[PDB]
Coordinates of C-alpha atoms and ligand atoms in Angstrom, one line a residue:
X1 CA 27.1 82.3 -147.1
X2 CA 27.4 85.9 -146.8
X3 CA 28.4 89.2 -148.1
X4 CA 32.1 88.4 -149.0
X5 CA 30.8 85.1 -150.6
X6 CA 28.2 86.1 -153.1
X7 CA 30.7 89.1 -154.1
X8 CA 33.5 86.4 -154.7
X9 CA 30.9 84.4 -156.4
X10 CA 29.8 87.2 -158.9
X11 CA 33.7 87.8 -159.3
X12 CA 34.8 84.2 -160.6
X13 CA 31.5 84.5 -162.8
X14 CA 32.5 87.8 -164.5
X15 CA 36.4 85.9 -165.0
X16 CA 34.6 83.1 -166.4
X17 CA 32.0 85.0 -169.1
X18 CA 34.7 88.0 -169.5
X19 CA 38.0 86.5 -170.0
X20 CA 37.4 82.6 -170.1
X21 CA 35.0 81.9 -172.1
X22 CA 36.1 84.0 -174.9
X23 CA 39.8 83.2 -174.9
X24 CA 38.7 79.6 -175.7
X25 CA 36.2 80.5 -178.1
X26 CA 39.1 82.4 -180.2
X27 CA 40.7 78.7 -180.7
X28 CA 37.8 77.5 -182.1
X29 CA 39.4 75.9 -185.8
X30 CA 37.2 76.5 -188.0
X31 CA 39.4 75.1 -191.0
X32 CA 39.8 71.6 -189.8
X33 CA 37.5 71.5 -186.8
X34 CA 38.2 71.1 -183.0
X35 CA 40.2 73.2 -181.6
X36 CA 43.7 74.9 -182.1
X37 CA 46.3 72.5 -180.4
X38 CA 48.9 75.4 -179.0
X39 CA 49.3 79.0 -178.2
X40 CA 53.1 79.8 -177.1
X41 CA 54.1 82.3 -174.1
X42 CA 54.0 85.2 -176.9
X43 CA 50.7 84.5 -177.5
X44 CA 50.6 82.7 -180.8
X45 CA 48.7 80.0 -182.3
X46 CA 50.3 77.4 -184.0
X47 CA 47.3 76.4 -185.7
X48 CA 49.3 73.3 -187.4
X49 CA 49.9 71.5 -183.6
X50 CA 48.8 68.3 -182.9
X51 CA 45.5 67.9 -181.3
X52 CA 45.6 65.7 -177.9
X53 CA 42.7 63.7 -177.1
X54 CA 42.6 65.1 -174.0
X55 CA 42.6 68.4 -174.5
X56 CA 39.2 68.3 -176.9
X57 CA 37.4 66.5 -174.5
X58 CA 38.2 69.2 -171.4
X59 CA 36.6 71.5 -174.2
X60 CA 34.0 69.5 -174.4
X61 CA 32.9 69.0 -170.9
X62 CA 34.1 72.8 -170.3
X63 CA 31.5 74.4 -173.0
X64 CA 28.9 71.7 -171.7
X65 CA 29.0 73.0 -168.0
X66 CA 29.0 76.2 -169.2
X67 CA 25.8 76.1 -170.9
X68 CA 24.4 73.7 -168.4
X69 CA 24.9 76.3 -165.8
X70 CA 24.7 79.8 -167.6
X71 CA 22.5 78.8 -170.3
X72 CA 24.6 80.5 -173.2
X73 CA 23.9 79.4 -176.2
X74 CA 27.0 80.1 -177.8
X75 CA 28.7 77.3 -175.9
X76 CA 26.4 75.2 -176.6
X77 CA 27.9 75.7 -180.2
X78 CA 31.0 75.7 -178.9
X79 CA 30.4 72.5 -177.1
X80 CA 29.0 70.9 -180.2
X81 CA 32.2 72.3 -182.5
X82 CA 34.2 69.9 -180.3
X83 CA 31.9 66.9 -179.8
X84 CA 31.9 66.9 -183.4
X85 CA 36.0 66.6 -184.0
X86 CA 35.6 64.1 -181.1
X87 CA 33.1 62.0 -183.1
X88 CA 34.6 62.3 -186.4
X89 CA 38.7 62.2 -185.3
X90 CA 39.2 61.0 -182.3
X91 CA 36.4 58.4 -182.0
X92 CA 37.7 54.8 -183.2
X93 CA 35.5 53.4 -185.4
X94 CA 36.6 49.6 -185.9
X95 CA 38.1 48.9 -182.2
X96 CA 35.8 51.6 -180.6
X97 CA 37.3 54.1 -177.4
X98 CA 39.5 57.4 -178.5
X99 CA 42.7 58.2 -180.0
X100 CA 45.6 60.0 -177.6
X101 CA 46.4 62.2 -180.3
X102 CA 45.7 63.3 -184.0
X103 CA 47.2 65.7 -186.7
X104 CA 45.4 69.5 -186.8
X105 CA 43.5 67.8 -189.6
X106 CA 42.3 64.9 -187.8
X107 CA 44.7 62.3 -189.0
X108 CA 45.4 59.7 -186.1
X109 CA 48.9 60.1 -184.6
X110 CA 48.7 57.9 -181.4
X111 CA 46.1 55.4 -181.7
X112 CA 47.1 53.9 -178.9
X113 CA 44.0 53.7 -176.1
X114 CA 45.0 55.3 -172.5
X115 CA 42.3 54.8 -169.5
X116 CA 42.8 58.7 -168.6
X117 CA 42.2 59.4 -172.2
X118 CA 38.8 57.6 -172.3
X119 CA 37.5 58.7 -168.8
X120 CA 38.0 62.4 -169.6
X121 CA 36.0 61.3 -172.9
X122 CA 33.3 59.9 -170.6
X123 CA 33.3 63.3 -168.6
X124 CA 32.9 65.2 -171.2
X125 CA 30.3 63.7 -173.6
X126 CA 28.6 62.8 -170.3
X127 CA 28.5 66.6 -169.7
X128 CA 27.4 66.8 -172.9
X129 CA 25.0 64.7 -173.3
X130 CA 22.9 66.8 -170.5
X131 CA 23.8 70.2 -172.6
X132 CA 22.1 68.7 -175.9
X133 CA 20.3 65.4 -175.2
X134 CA 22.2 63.8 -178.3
X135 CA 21.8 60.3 -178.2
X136 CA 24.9 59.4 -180.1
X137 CA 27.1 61.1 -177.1
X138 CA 25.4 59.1 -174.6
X139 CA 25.8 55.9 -176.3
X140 CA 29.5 56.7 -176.8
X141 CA 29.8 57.6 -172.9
X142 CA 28.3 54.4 -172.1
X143 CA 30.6 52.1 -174.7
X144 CA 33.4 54.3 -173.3
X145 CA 32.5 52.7 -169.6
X146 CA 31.6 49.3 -171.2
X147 CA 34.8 48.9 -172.6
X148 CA 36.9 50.5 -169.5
X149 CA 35.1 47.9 -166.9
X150 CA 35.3 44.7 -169.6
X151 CA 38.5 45.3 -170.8
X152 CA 40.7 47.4 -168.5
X153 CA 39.8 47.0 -164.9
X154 CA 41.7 44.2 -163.0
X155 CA 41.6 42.9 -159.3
X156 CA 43.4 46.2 -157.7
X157 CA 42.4 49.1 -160.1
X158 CA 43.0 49.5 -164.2
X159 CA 45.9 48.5 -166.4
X160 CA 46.3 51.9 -168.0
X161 CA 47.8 51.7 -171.3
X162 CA 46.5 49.6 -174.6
X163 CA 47.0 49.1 -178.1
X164 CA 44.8 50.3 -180.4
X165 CA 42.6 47.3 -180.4
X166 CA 43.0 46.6 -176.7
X167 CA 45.6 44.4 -176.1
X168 CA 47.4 45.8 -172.8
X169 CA 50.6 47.2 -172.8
X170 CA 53.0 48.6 -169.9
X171 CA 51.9 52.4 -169.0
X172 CA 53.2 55.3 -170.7
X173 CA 53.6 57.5 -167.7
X174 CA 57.1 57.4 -165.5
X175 CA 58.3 58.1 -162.4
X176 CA 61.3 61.2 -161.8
X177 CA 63.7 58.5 -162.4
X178 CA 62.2 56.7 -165.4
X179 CA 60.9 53.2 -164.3
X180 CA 57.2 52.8 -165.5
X181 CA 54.4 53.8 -163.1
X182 CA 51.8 50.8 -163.8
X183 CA 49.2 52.3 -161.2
X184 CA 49.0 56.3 -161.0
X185 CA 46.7 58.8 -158.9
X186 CA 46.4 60.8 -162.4
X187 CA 44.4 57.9 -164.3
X188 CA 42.3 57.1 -161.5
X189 CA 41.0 59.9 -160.2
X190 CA 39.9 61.1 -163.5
X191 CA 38.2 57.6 -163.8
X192 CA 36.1 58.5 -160.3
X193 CA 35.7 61.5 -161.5
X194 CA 34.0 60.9 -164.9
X195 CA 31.8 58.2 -163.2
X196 CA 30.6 60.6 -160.7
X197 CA 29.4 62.0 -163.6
X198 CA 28.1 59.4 -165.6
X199 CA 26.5 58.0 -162.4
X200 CA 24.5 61.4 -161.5
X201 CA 23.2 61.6 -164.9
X202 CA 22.7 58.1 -165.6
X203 CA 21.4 56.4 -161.9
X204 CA 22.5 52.9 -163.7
X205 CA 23.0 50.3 -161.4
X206 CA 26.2 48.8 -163.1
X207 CA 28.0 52.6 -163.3
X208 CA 26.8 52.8 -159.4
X209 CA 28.6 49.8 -158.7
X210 CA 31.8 50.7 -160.6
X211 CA 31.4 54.4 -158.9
X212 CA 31.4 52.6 -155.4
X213 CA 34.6 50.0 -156.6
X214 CA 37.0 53.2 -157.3
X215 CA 36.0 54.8 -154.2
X216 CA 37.1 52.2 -152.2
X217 CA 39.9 51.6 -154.5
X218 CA 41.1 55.6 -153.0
X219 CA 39.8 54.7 -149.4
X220 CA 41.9 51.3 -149.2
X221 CA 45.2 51.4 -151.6
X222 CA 45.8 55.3 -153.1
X223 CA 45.5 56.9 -150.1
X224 CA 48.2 57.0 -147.4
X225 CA 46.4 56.2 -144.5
X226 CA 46.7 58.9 -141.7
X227 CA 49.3 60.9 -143.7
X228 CA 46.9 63.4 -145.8
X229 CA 48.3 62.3 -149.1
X230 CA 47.5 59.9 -151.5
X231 CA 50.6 58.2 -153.7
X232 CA 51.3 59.6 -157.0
X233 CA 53.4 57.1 -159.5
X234 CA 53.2 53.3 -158.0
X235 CA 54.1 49.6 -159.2
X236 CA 51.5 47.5 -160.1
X237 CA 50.7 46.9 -156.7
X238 CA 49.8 50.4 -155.4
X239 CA 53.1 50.2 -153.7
X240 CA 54.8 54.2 -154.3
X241 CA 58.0 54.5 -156.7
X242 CA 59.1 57.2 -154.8
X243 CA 58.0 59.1 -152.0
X244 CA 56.2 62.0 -153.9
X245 CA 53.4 64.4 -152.6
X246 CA 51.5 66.2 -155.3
X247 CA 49.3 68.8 -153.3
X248 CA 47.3 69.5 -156.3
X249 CA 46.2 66.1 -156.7
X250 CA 45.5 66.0 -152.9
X251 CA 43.2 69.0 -152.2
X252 CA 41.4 68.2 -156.2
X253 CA 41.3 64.6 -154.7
X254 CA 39.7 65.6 -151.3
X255 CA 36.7 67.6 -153.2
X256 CA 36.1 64.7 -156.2
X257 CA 36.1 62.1 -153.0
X258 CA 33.7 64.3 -151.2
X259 CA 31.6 64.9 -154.3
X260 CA 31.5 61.3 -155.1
X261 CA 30.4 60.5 -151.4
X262 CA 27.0 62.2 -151.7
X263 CA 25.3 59.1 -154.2
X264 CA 27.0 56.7 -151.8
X265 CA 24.8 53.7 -150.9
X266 CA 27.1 52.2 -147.9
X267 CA 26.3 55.0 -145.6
X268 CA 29.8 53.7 -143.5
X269 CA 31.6 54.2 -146.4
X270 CA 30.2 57.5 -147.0
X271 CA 31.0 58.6 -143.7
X272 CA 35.0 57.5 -144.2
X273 CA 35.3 58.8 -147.3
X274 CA 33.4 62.4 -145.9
X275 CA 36.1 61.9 -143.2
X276 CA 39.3 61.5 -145.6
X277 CA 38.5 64.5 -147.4
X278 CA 38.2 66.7 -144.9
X279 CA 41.7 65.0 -143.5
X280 CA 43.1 66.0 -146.2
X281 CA 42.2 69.8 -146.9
X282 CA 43.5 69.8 -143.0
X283 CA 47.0 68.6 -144.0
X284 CA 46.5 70.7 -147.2
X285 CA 46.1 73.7 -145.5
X286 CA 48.6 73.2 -142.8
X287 CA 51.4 71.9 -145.2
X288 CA 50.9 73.8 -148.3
X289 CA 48.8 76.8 -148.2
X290 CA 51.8 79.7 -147.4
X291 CA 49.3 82.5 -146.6
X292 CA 48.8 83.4 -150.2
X293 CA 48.5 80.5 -152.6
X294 CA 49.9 76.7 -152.4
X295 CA 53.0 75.1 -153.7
X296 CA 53.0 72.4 -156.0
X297 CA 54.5 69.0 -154.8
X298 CA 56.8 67.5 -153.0
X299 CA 59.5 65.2 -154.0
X300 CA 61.6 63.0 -151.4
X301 CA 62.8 65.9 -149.6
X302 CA 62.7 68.5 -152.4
X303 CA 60.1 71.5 -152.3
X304 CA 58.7 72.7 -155.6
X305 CA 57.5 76.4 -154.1
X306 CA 56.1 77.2 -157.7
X307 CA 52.6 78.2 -158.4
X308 CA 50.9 76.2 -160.8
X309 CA 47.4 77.3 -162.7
X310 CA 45.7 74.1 -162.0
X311 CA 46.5 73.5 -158.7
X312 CA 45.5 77.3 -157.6
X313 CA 42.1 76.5 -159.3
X314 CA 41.8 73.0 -157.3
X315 CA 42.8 74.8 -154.6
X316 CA 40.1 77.2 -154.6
X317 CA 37.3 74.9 -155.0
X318 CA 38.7 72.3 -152.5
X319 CA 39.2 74.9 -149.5
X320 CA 35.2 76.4 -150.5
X321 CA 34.4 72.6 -150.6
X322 CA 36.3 72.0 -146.4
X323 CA 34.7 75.3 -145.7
X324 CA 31.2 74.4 -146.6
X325 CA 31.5 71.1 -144.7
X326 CA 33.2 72.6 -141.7
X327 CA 32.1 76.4 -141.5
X328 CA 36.0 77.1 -140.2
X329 CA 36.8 80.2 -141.6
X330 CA 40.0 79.4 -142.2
X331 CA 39.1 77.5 -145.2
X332 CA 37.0 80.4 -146.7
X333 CA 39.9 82.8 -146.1
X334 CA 42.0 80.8 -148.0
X335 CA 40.4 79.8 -151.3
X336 CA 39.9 83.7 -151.4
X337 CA 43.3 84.5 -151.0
X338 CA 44.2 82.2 -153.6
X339 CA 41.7 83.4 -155.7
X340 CA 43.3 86.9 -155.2
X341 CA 46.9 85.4 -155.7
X342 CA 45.5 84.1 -159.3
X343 CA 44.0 87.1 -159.9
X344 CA 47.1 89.3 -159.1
X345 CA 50.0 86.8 -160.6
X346 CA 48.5 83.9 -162.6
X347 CA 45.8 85.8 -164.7
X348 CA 47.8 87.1 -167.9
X349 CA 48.0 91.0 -167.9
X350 CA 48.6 91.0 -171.4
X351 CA 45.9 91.0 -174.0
X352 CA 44.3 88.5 -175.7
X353 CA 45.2 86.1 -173.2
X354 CA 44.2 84.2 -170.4
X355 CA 46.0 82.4 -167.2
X356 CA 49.5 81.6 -167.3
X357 CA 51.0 78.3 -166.9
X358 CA 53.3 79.1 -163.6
X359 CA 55.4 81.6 -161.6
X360 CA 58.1 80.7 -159.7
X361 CA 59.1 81.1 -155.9
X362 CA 59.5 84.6 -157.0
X363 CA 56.4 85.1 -158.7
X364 CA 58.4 85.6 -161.4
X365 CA 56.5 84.4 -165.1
X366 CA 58.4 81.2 -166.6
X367 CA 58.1 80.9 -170.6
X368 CA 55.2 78.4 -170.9
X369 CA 52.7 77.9 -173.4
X370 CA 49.2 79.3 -172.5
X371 CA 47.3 76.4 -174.3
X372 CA 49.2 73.1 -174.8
X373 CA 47.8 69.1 -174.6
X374 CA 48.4 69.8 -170.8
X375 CA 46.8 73.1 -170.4
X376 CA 42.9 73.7 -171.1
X377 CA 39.8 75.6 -169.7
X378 CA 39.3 72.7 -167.3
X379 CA 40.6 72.9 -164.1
X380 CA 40.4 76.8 -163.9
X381 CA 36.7 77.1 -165.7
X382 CA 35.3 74.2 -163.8
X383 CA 36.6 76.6 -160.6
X384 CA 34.9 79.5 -161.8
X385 CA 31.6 76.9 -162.8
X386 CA 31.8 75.1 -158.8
X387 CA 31.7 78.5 -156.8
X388 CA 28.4 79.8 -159.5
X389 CA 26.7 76.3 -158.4
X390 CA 27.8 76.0 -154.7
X391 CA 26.8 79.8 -153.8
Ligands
DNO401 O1 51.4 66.2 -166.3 C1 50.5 66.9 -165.8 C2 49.0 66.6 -166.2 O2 49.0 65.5 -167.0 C3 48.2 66.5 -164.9 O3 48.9 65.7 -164.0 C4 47.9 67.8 -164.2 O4 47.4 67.5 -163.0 C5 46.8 68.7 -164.9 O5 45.7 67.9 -165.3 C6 47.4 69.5 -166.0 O6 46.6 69.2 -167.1
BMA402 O1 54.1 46.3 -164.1 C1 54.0 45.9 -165.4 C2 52.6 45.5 -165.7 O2 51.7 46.6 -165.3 C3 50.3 46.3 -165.6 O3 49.4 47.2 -165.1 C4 50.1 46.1 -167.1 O4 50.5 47.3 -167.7 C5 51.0 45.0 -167.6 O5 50.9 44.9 -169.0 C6 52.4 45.2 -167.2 O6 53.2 44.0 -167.5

């Protein structure tokens, strides 16, 4: 720590109670419950979208973490306004787990059960659980796991895509060229993630186990050994369907790893995994930070040079994370720069708004919604929420 650090510190915690936390609280729908499903590039709500699954439950956890680290009590509320639609809507009563998607007034869409869908439920109530203490989050958390390790786990990681009632079906997500991606980074890292969660609340030997099995999963099969990325879109067998480098995923990946390696038992896997993560914020920093802020991914040979909210907030949080392990400077100089890129290109200068989807190579704004399925308080909160906890 020093001067520069508590200053950015107080800095992301005035964005985040200023301009964050508000702009979420105005899609707060109080006709139907949840929260509004869309908000276009001009700035309006279509307050008839479809609700995704996902979307609530980054709400969730986002208005949970807030309160568990500021105290307000107004996210609390807000917190509760979404567990709520969650419990009510998206919550399956007969065959248990949640909904992808339901109608703006709750009416199921896509019942169909997705492993990414029900570990960002797990985050979430999880996260909310420790905001409000309500036993009926907890016990939905921990059916939510339950369900994922009895049901959806297999020998080399989880089939990814269900019917309603469980019955497995082939995965929903494809590769660039259209052939099904049966094992993808995106599904699994949200499942470490929201048992890192679970885990540190919980201290349950079962949910350590699992925590430790998805670890190792990243250590032995995602991750492409001495290369600083892990695959994106694979078979069934963790074998890649194209050569694709996501750096987002890589340098969210190498913070999440590290994070998960502190309640690790095996103190050789612990070191490894300590080790991979800082690997990969090396080759993250060396291969994708420009100076300013880092591209997005790389496809075959193709460079995507745009500048994508999410993986500017990852960014931030997983260069603090290298520097706080290392003390290189380098590191600290670049989450703040990226941090000052966001703040400069990515944070909407218009009012009533918040951050923007993208720019281009040329920083140019591209027509994207500011609040979609895809887009949520999330990523760029929880960046804001890491540095206030960290500092
Ligand atoms: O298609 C993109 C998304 O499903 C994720 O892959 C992305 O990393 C962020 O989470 C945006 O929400
Ligand atoms: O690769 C196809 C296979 O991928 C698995 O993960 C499951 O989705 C199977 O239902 C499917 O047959």
């Amino acid at each position: 720590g020093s001067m520069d650090i508590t200053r950015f510190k107080e800095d992301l915690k005035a964005h985040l109670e200023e301009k964050i936390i508000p702009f979420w609280q105005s899609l707060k729908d109080d006709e139907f419950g949840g929260y509004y499903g869309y908000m276009d590039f001009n700035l309006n709500i279509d307050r008839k979208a479809q609700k995704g699954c996902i979307l609530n439950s980054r709400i969730l956890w986002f208005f949970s973490a807030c309160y568990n680290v500021l105290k307000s009590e107004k996210c609390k509320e807000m917190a509760f306004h979404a567990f709520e639609f969650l419990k009510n809507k998206f919550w399956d009563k007969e065959y248990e787990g949640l909904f992808w998607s339901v109608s703006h007034k709750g009416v199921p869409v896509d019942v169909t059960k997705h492993v990414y869908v029900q570990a960002f439920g797990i985050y979430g109530l999880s996260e909310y659980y420790e905001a409000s203490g309500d036993e009926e989050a907890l016990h939905m958390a921990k059916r939510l796991f339950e369900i994922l390790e009895t049901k959806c786990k297999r020998e080399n990681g989880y089939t990814e895509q269900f019917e309603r009632n469980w019955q497995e079906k082939e995965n929903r997500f494809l590769s660039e060229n259209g052939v099904i991606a049966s094992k993808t980074m995106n599904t699994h890292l949200h499942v470490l993630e929201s048992y890192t969660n679970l885990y540190r609340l919980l201290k349950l030997d079962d949910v350590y186990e699992a925590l430790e099995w998805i670890v190792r999963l990243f250590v032995d099969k995602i991750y492409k050994k001495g290369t600083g990325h892990f695959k994106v879109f694979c078979d069934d067998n963790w074998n890649e369907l194209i050569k694709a480098v996501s750096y987002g995923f890589d340098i969210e990946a190498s913070w999440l790893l590290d994070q998960a390696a502190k309640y690790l038992k095996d103190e050789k896997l612990k070191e490894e995994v300590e080790k991979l993560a800082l690997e990969v914020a090396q080759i993250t920093l060396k291969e994708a930070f420009d100076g300013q802020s880092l591209i997005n991914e790389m496809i075959e040979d193709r460079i995507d040079r745009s500048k994508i909210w999410w993986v500017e907030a990852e960014t931030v949080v997983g260069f603090f994370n290298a520097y706080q392990k290392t003390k290189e400077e380098k590191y600290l100089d670049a989450a703040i720069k990226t941090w000052e890129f966001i703040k400069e290109h990515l944070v909407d200068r218009r009012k009533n708004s918040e951050w923007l989807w993208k720019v281009n190579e040329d920083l140019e704004a591209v027509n994207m919604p500011i609040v979609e399925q895809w887009k949520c308080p999330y990523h760029n909160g929880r960046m804001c929420l890491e540095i206030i906890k960290r500092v």
